[PDB]
Design a binder for this molecule. Structure first.
Ligand SMILES: [Zn+2]
Ligand SMILES: [Zn+2]
Ligand SMILES: [Zn+2]
Ligand SMILES: [Zn+2]
Lengths: 383, 383
């Protein structure tokens, strides 16, 4: 006859992890808090350190006959709040106003992470039967690099999964596919000369311009001819540029960076080879070269929309939730590089328009309901 | 039986104006020095102030019957010396080593200016006959803006000239034509959006790229089809660029600057209209616009190579000097906007490769000879 966890504690746990400022760092403080919570309920977590102060957390709960393994994942970092004077309620204070809990990370994605941890605890304490294992994977650095997701995948922590739910904010929709993301840099080398007698120089800005023209034309042709039924066309933008040193000097250096959002129908390998090809055609017959560097490279993700995991989730509702795609990357871009196929979906509480925005909040009733819905999902999937 | 000016004084005058650091300013100190020198020899100059501390100097000497007016012009500013540790001899110390007098401005163009002033004084004191007037026009700010040249032309000080020599460093060649120079800026306005969902934005870098492609192609077509017999083809380079604020944001601002060197066969009016046309074609059907600003606009210069002034100069030599053109602008780009035609040439002492360079020097024998050659030129032209 063990006591239930009360509503006020479920809310306080979320507030206390929001108040841990974990902007591109400090995830070890969030992991320690959640590992201490799990220990209060006789679940022993495993800390997997990324770097000083930045720790991932893994935890398992098994019951019944050896069966499938269901992973529940979320990230512990958040994006910067920006100018805090612009917020109505302070971003790391986790204030409650009515049904809203305000704070950076309330929607993206400390509510989903807390809901997953509490769902595991309540699953255990409910004593309800199932046959398999549920595994938490709480990651470092999803927002800038998917650092923990890559670390855990390379280490082997995804190898036993039959299915994975990532608790990013989808509200009541199931995101089963999302785009990839590439950030790249092109650097252009030239030779200085005075603008009045330029023949001994080489204009680095001109050579960079020729890359922009050709890459834009090739990427637009790719958008016009190939598309994904859910995610749309490949996206490409040059987003930063610099070059030159004085108005009357031929520029000896220029550089740009750009962002691409990719789809399975024309994958990252092909995009990078295409960019490299363009650089190669433009470097013919000169010793003043463009050079391509890939700074970020996250693959598209596409799961089976009819998987047993998705069926187990839809079984929790009197009407099926919408299946959707999204543009932004998630830690699935790293976990899906594991050397086997697993069922996958993104499903988490939150307000879909508010990740990374001023005055971010989550709806308390949504958060509390997802604690219960995760338990139902686990019990169905692991039946 | 008045005393001659000795060689050592002619050299000391040049050293003392080189030691007045007049980098884009302080020309009033050079003007005051030269006006005091003229007064020691009973020539009264006229100070024409540009701004506090930046004064032009005009002086006249007449003899005989009213006749032609010959102008002698030079500028009193110099370009920056840069890192002085890179110089072998300190740039504002005017040290003499053998036949070389080292210093910023020694070649460009304090030697020509001092030689013109001394030539006027010696012309007067020689008592040699002529019929007309020789007029010094010593200007502020030739290197950045041709400020004094424009001021004096607008005021009316060029209106009486029949001929003009500018004493820039040509060594023993006669520069009778030079290119124009335009510096321009193009600013591109767009709209911010996240790189993952860019449809509500507008990429300012892309629109700027389209300007570079079209302006480069039109300017190259102009180079390939039109040329000047002495000055060559029109030159165009984009030399500075910037744009964007974050790699995952569609850029809302971008800008470039560029430099053009123009020829009489396709003059500045036409170049500016062509650039504007390109901006206009590219702004069709959008509210996110490119904008053109002209920052510098100096016209080409072309004199009569067979003028009486040139004949008077060639009469000083047993073999004619080469007639040449040059790429760089001079104050003639402002003086030739006077509302009448005058004979023109650039002829001055100096080492042609050294304007604006480290370890600039002038050859002392070249400087002293030009003091004498200017007097001969005046006496012939004003015979
Ligand atoms: Zn997230
Ligand atoms: Zn996020
Ligand atoms: Zn000069
Ligand atoms: Zn100069």
């Amino acid at each position: 006859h063990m006591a239930s966890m009360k509503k006020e504690e479920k809310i306080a746990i979320l507030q206390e992890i929001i108040r841990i400022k974990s902007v591109n760092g400090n995830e070890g403080e969030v992991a320690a808090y959640l590992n201490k919570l799990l220990a209060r309920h006789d679940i022993t977590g495993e800390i997997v350190s990324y770097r000083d102060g930045r720790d991932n957390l893994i935890a398992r709960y098994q019951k019944g006959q050896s069966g499938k393994v269901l992973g529940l994942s979320g990230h512990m970092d958040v994006v910067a709040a920006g100018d805090e004077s612009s917020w109505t309620y302070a971003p790391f204070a986790a204030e409650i106003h009515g049904n809203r809990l305000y704070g950076r990370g309330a929607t993206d994605m400390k509510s989903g992470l807390a809901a997953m941890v509490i769902a595991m605890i309540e699953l255990k304490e409910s004593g309800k039967p199932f046959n398999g294992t549920v595994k938490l994977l709480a990651t470092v650095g999803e927002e800038v690099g998917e650092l923990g997701g890559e670390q855990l995948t390379k280490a082997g922590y995804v190898d036993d999964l039959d299915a994975l739910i990532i608790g990013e904010p989808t509200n009541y929709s199931l995101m089963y596919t999302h785009m990839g993301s590439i950030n790249y840099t092109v650097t252009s080398h030239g030779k200085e000369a005075h603008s009045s007698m330029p023949d001994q120089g080489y204009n680095a800005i001109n050579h960079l311009n020729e890359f922009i023209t050709k890459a834009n034309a090739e990427m637009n042709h790719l958008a016009e001819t190939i598309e994904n039924p859910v995610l749309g066309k490949t996206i490409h933008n040059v987003t930063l540029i610099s070059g030159g040193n004085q108005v009357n000097s031929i520029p000896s250096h220029a550089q740009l960076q750009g962002n691409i959002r990719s789809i399975p129908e024309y994958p990252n390998d092909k995009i990078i080879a295409l960019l490299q090809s363009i650089v190669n055609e433009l470097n013919q017959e000169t010793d003043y070269h463009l050079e391509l560097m890939i700074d970020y490279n996250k693959i598209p993700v596409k799961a089976d929309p009819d998987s047993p995991l998705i069926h187990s989730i839809q079984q929790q509702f009197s009407q099926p939730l919408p299946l959707v795609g999204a543009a932004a990357t998630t830690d699935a871009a790293e976990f899906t590089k594991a050397n086997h196929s697993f069922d996958f979906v993104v499903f988490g509480p939150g307000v879909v328009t508010l990740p990374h925005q001023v005055d971010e909040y989550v709806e308390i009733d949504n958060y509390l309901d997802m604690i219960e819905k995760y338990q139902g999902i686990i019990l169905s999937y692991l039946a």
